[PDB]
Amino acid sequence: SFEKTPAIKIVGNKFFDSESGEQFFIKGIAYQLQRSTSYIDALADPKICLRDIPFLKMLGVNTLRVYAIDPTKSHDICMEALSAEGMYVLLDLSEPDISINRENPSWDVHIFERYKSVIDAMSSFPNLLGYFAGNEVTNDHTNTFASPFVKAAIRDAKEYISHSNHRKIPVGYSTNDDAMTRDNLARYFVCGDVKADFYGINMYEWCGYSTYGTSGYRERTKEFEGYPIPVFFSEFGCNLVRPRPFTEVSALYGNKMSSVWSGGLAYMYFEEENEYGVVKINDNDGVDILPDFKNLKKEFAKADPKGITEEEYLTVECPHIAVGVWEANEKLPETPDRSKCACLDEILPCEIVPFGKYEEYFSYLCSKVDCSDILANGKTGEYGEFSDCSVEQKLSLQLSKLYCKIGANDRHCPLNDKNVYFNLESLQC
Ligand SMILES: OC[C@H]1O[C@@H](O[C@@H]2[C@@H](O)[C@H](O[C@@H]3[C@@H](O)[C@H](n4cc(CCC[n+]5ccccc5)nn4)O[C@H](CO)[C@H]3O)O[C@H](CO)[C@H]2O)[C@H](O)[C@@H](O)[C@@H]1O
């Protein structure tokens, strides 16, 4: 049963409860456990989530941000338990080992399959608020060319959801707060023919007992006034001054900011040797409440954002390219084609299995054959025909091209490595 969490929908630049029609404001906290899979999925483990939900209820949150789930595991126990307390989930589609790499960006079948798997695992829950298609991918002026790959991911996640039987859960983006790139990033993700459905900023400008004017919150609010999609703080809670008073919460849900922002999520629930937690899990797996907890609790309790209803509410150019400043082309890479890339597994004479060596093997093979067909350039908007295939498929293509160039036809692939093998399926889309 999900009566207490009706699905939230987007109209214009605001969230709305689909039943009542009241504006939905996010009063949230990040909820994600680490190790000392690589990620831990707290929503796949009832003993973890059912321990914490009572404490989350005390905080008075209506939303969690979760950065990683294991899509092979069940989540209905934790998601229904969250729904029981009126709590929604914002969920990143990526994870640390399967993300768009800001140092070498690609939008490919491997990353897209990860996104699909999370979508298929989590879309049945009415309290799934939205998906993030990326988190701080571009983070400064040196990697703005990663952003077209994220926009392609937004488009393709939205289309995948559209073509599924699922509820059309919105797909957005979470960005950092770098001064040189923030205005261009915000414009880029709503420009042209592809748009993020919502926009989260990881916002740490307000530290200690600051103010609306002095923190920078006033300038941010004036910048995002009239922004065409919902905007919120996907993270907040600068910890320079402790215990964190969380006085930004009073500003965030006040009348000046509540007209522009759709709330935000504190970072975070768990303490992980970083002084960002509101609780600490002890050696007996029990929850010890930390000094920040009471301050966030009081601030959320006092917050009462005056929104507008759905019915009364009902009544862009991409940034130009400039070298060293903004290098994200409007032209996006194509939708990764699993069938095309899977046909390389069939027909290619020389293949390499996944298991440092990528840099060496690409450097070696791309000096002997033309690797243009696997390159992807977000600056120039030039995307090779097989640039959407997996790193292994890309490598295999180049090895196979070298094999055909030599033309011995003796089943000896021209790269001595144990991961290399001659594909017997090639001899038989
Ligand atoms: O796509 C961009 C990059 O994504 C990386 O993975 C991603 C990963 O780094 C990210 O990690 C977040 C991490 O960004 C977030 N976090 C918050 C903070 C506090 C920052 C404090 N602070 C204070 C003041 C100013 C600025 C900052 N520190 N870390 O904490 C989350 C839960 O603890 C954690 O999961 O989570 C994503 C989703 O799962 C992965 O997609 C990949 O590993 C990189 O290869 C890739 O380049």
Side-chain angles (χ1 to χ4, degrees):
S1 182
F2 293 87
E3 319 315 21
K4 321 115 294 187
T5 57
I8 304 306
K9 69 186 187 172
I10 298 171
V11 186
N13 61 4
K14 294 170 193 298
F15 289 109
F16 293 97
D17 185 304
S18 60
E19 292 180 6
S20 70
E22 301 285 0
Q23 179 167 14
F24 178 82
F25 287 90
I26 298 158
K27 286 188 181 181
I29 192 169
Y31 183 79
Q32 190 71 53
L33 212 49
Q34 300 301 144
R35 298 181 196 284
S36 56
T37 61
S38 60
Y39 59 86
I40 293 169
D41 186 352
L43 302 188
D45 198 0
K47 73 171 177 294
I48 298 173
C49 77
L50 301 174
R51 179 196 65 196
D52 298 321
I53 286 159
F55 293 93
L56 295 163
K57 184 193 171 62
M58 286 198 299
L59 287 174
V61 301
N62 68 0
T63 314
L64 305 183
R65 183 172 184 185
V66 176
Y67 297 85
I69 61 105
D70 184 340
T72 67
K73 297 181 180 292
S74 179
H75 302 86
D76 63 344
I77 292 172
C78 293
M79 291 297 286
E80 288 173 48
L82 288 164
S83 181
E85 306 302 334
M87 295 174 188
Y88 295 80
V89 176
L90 283 161
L91 179 55
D92 295 74
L93 297 170
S94 61
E95 61 105 331
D97 298 341
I98 312 180
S99 294
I100 295 163
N101 196 316
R102 70 174 73 82
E103 307 301 330
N104 179 28
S106 181
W107 178 236
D108 59 59
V109 294
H110 189 246
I111 309 171
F112 191 24
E113 286 308 305
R114 164 66 193 189
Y115 282 32
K116 288 177 194 174
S117 296
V118 172
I119 288 163
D120 293 332
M122 304 298 293
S123 292
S124 71
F125 306 116
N127 63 329
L128 207 309
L129 177 51
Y131 294 121
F132 289 116
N135 183 60
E136 308 189 339
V137 183
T138 293
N139 61 10
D140 61 36
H141 78 119
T142 74
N143 51 34
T144 64
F145 52 78
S147 290
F149 298 89
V150 183
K151 279 194 80 175
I154 290 165
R155 177 196 64 204
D156 294 336
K158 287 167 68 166
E159 182 52 42
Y160 184 77
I161 292 165
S162 183
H163 191 56
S164 76
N165 290 139
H166 304 309
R167 178 173 60 88
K168 307 316 175 198
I169 293 163
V171 180
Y173 181 66
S174 183
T175 193
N176 69 326
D177 191 33
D178 170 75
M180 197 179 184
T181 53
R182 65 189 168 193
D183 292 355
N184 285 331
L185 282 160
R187 187 142 65 89
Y188 187 69
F189 281 99
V190 295
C191 79
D193 301 312
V194 171
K195 302 168 200 63
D197 294 330
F198 55 85
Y199 200 74
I201 305 163
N202 301 322
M203 175 52 60
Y204 294 90
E205 290 176 17
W206 187 302
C207 305
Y209 298 92
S210 192
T211 69
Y212 180 60
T214 60
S215 62
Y217 275 30
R218 185 161 61 199
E219 185 58 63
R220 298 298 84 71
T221 305
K222 290 177 180 185
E223 282 169 12
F224 280 97
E225 197 186 344
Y227 190 69
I229 60 174
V231 68
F232 57 94
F233 301 163
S234 47
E235 289 172 13
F236 72 87
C238 177
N239 70 349
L240 184 66
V241 180
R242 285 167 73 248
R244 283 178 294 180
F246 287 111
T247 54
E248 62 266 38
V249 170
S250 294
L252 181 54
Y253 305 99
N255 296 314
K256 294 155 166 279
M257 296 191 69
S258 64
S259 62
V260 177
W261 305 89
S262 295
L265 306 99
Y267 186 91
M268 73 151 307
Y269 186 74
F270 298 108
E271 176 60 24
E272 298 184 312
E273 305 182 351
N274 57 1
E275 295 73 47
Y276 284 108
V278 298
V279 309
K280 171 58 176 180
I281 306 304
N282 62 47
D283 295 321
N284 206 32
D285 294 305
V287 174
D288 293 338
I289 290 174
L290 300 174
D292 286 2
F293 195 97
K294 66 183 144 279
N295 295 341
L296 188 58
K297 174 179 171 70
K298 172 140 196 170
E299 286 283 339
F300 277 141
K302 208 181 83 192
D304 183 25
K306 288 186 168 180
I308 56 172
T309 60
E310 192 192 331
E311 294 295 340
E312 75 186 309
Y313 179 61
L314 282 162
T315 309
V316 359
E317 190 175 312
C318 296
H320 67 274
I321 300 285
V323 173
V325 179
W326 188 254
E327 309 180 324
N329 208 285
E330 178 170 359
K331 295 178 174 65
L332 310 178
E334 296 287 301
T335 303
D337 192 341
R338 193 189 63 76
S339 299
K340 179 190 79 187
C341 297
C343 289
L344 296 177
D345 300 334
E346 280 187 14
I347 76 190
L348 288 178
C350 292
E351 301 281 11
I352 183 157
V353 309
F355 295 173
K357 60 149 200 307
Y358 288 116
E359 224 288 332
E360 180 54 38
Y361 282 152
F362 280 122
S363 295
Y364 172 70
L365 289 171
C366 300
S367 65
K368 319 312 185 188
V369 301
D370 187 1
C371 286
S372 298
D373 59 10
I374 60 161
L375 298 178
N377 192 326
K379 312 147 174 285
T380 63
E382 291 178 302
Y383 308 106
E385 185 182 1
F386 298 99
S387 64
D388 63 315
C389 299
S390 72
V391 182
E392 296 80 11
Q393 289 164 335
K394 288 164 158 168
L395 237 208
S396 301
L397 176 54
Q398 307 314 314
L399 183 59
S400 290
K401 285 155 61 169
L402 186 54
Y403 171 81
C404 296
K405 185 171 184 171
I406 295 159
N409 198 38
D410 67 326
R411 316 195 182 186
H412 280 119
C413 294
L415 187 71
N416 299 118
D417 190 283
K418 81 175 212 180
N419 289 33
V420 174
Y421 68 100
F422 183 82
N423 183 25
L424 296 169
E425 176 68 297
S426 72
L427 302 172
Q428 314 312 319
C429 179

